[PDB]
Symmetry: C2
Subunit: 127 residues, 2 copies
């Protein structure tokens, strides 16, 4: 309930018009098995950590801050206590997005790893 | 266990894509095998991610070509696309969600307010979900 009261306050500061609200992309995709929903929401809490950290950074000089640190703490607590497995997987998934596509050595290393990787992928299906 | 043609085609490719055994086995593989433990859901998801990564890769390997390497690449691209599509539809869907969350413009003010407009709903949903007495019972197992 401090949560919800702190959020309404922040909304006073992070005020946008309806024209901006509805025009453009919706921020999130739609919530999609239980393990599937947990992981997605682990994605979501992680996003909020990231998001609120930029908000703090964008505050002047560097109560609003007091408010932001509260929701940051709360989001962090939930992720740390109840989303540990999901977070280890999400990191794996982010790590794949960092591989250097243009690098010749990596291309050739990946190429060599393809055989095992395609064996494994194939067998996971006809199980 | 894989097609002969896949194996053979990969070997032919490794001729053009030639590197020292030192640089190849420097203790840093491209793709970890570590996330192929735990549940079937986790393995399928991670594997779906690897197949998506390879499709990107092979793409670039085709761009960085000038002017039978090209057909060997195109063949290897096709077999990966086909496996993804035919066995990893559910996983690709989720992954597109996760990739999308990853891409959000977090330093933009409009985005911050829209995201903030959903925090309560999203926190509540996160919390509610994260004890259904199978998720709570599963989290107890690993302690």
């Amino acid at each position: 309930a401090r949560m919800n009261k702190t959020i309404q306050n922040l909304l006073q500061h992070y005020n946008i018009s309806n024209k901006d609200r509805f025009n453009g992309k919706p921020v999130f995709p739609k919530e999609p098995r239980m393990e599937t929903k947990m992981l997605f929401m682990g994605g979501v809490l992680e996003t909020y950590e990231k998001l609120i950290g930029q908000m703090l950074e964008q505050l002047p000089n560097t109560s609003v801050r007091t408010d932001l640190n509260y929701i940051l703490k709360k989001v962090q607590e939930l992720r740390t206590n109840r989303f540990k497995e999901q977070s280890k997987l999400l990191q794996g998934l982010h790590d794949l997005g960092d591989i250097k596509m243009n690098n010749f050595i990596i291309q050739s290393k990946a190429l060599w790893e393809l055989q095992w990787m395609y064996e494994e992928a194939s067998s996971l299906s006809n199980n």
